[PDB]
Symmetry: D2
């Protein structure tokens, strides 16, 4: 990985990446493993966790994976316990896991998205805090989205990610005493930096690497006084 960060920046650290088997989660896992982290991939599909862990191992990285539906509280409790039994500590967590007009969204559709894009990340963060981070300090990055003026055509995802942005701030306040930082990233339209439509002022679509580098920055010692903060990665499309 052609990272902007110095080699070995995350040597020896255990970092959970939910949704780690695909997309931005997979890109971020790869960059963190290239920087020396032991990445713990979490996701619903064991098959793409396996394949992405396969890539990371071939590329010389250190990785483990767990198949888990993080939308279920008992599963998350056991997941975090199983990770701690294997690793001893969790240094960081990346909550990466997660279209219709409002008039067409059903109660079940709205609630499924809340569980996927808000409740799941809340449960992983709560258990990571309760079981480990409340004792050690650490940092958490939540995946959001460009919902700042609402999210037309995706109102249920906007409400969920707005909820997750609020949780980010609340947790930054409530958990700061334990040395725990909680931040977020809000990518815009993601497919010219590649370490791995025209209503964008920069006039291009972003890359997975362009989201991962912001996530990695927020986990790094350089972000040690950054908490409660969302980095938008949208080419200024939200402005």
């Amino acid at each position: 990985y052609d990272s902007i960060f110095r080699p070995g920046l995350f040597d020896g650290q255990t970092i959970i990446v939910t949704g780690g088997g695909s997309g931005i989660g997979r890109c971020t896992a790869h960059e963190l493993a290239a920087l020396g982290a032991h990445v713990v991939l979490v996701g619903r599909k064991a098959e793409k966790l396996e394949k992405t862990a396969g890539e990371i191992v071939e590329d010389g990285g250190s990785v483990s994976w767990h198949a888990c539906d993080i939308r279920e509280e008992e599963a998350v409790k056991t997941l975090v316990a199983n990770i701690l039994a294997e690793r001893g500590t969790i240094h960081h967590l990346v909550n990466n896991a997660g279209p219709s007009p409002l008039a067409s969204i059903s109660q079940k559709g709205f609630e499924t998205v809340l569980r996927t894009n808000l409740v799941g990340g809340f449960l992983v963060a709560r258990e990571v805090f309760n079981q480990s981070m409340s004792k050690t300090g650490g940092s958490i990055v939540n995946m959001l989205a460009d919902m700042w003026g609402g999210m037309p055509g995706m109102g249920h995802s906007g409400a969920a990610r707005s909820g997750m942005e609020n949780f980010t701030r609340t947790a930054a306040v409530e958990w700061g005493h334990a040395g725990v930082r909680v931040n977020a990233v809000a990518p815009g339209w993601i497919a010219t930096y590649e370490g791995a439509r025209e209503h964008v002022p920069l006039k291009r679509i972003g890359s997975e690497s362009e989201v991962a580098a912001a996530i990695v920055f927020l986990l790094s010692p350089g972000a040690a006084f950054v908490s409660g903060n969302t980095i938008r990665i949208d080419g200024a499309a939200s402005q």
Copy 2:
């Protein structure tokens, strides 16, 4: 009611007030009925809907009430249908219906609050739009809360009301073509205007009347170009 608004401002209009049997909902219902509206009180408890409808009738107002759990989609669909069969049109909707450290909030606790403080209001607004307002225009006001920097000690309510603030914006955008305005109010600490702790710059607690007047303003013709907007009623405590 000693309202700041002119008599008869809402003559002949049907206005749904969820959570209408108590607190801010009851205060707002009273002011709207004093201004000539036919207020339709909706709530889980028939007993306090009955008693508040009793007060409004004695005070010379026009009112109906329906006991309904608005957290259930089929019930809401029938509720709105039953209101339209009785009234013909719904001119406005007030979504008024709705403590623990984050570490202690369970999945069921978090999800119950999302359903109460986000999903319920979404369902009433969606059905009011789908069954009537999409054809006539109208306005909707959602109850929020002071969650702007998160809501420590009430993280689940903050995430829910942040979600409801996002829905307010999304619905203002998606439904504006139908002549539908969607706005919100975010009260701070509510118990010197009474038409019916010291970290507040105004150095007092707010009143129910001080929230109702903002809700009524947003339903009025004076707010005809106000949409997607949240009025904070918190004595500047959020600043």
Copy 3:
């Protein structure tokens, strides 16, 4: 004036309206005078202050006017003194007074707009507070603009009005102990409520009356616990 507010709502009150001789200032002055206020029009041009005061007098209202460049501190100090000598108290203040790519804005152009759209309103508010409102309580409404995601094509006005929005919050905090509320209105594109382009979700341009009613609401007893708050009047165009 066909106001949504009850007759006599501002009986006996002295209200300063800067920029009161034209546009939104003139509309707001007319509505406040129709509600019984003694409106004090302030502006650079005596001729349009005279003509608007003429209209208000013919329409049966109470009004005085002062020609003053509020961008000059000594003039403002004497202005407020002269108003207090005539009226005894100032109950409310409406700061209403106030295109180029950024690359073309000169230092003098940028600074002229800061003085017009930020410094002037700061000086009037400061003197109104220092000379009277700090002793009596009262409320202030500042005119802003739709600058929430910046103000492309009008970057100097956006920076000025963002500065004025910040002042609104700071003053709400610093002056709340004196019973002084400080709020703002941010109109969007202003030319269906008329008490006196298609990237708008409501699909129309706003009216002067649709801004004035929000200003009047913020001065009213109904807004007694509203401070530090900006009402956007933009048809949801900012969302």
Copy 4:
């Protein structure tokens, strides 16, 4: 400098750092020079530009300095011209340059702070864009402050930095077509990462290094799709 970024990340690049002779500007200049940048220090005092350039040269870095009052437009025009004659290109710009109750702030006091904390940075950015960056692309980082809910006790600085935050967004939109990113950092209370009061949830004061790393991140290829974005560095104190 013990930077989190890989050696040579800014090899061969010319980066202007206003206010570069002291504080956060000096810390950021040192980190960028340690990463291979040619840092151009700009400030009012030649003596502390000289001394900080002395440190950077001793530490093995590449640096030039110009004494300039950036609050004056003609001086800035010549400054940028002189830098381009020496360097050929400007790859990045760090606008780092920049207490009283509102009631006590005079027109001259308010205006001096606007010129220092808003106009100066606008002029440097405008000329850097007009003379060079509009042709090459590049990125700009503006120093702000924690003014999100106003800035009590520092109302003039809050209005100025809110104005500068607005300019950041406007410039990100207007200049994005040229490949120019414009971002900001908003430090909170700055004096546990040191690469070079108790109302903070993290329960400590931040360091200069903890601001510089965020600035450096925003200039880096990792931030290539980040524009119009402010990183708060305040230990979650603003939440």
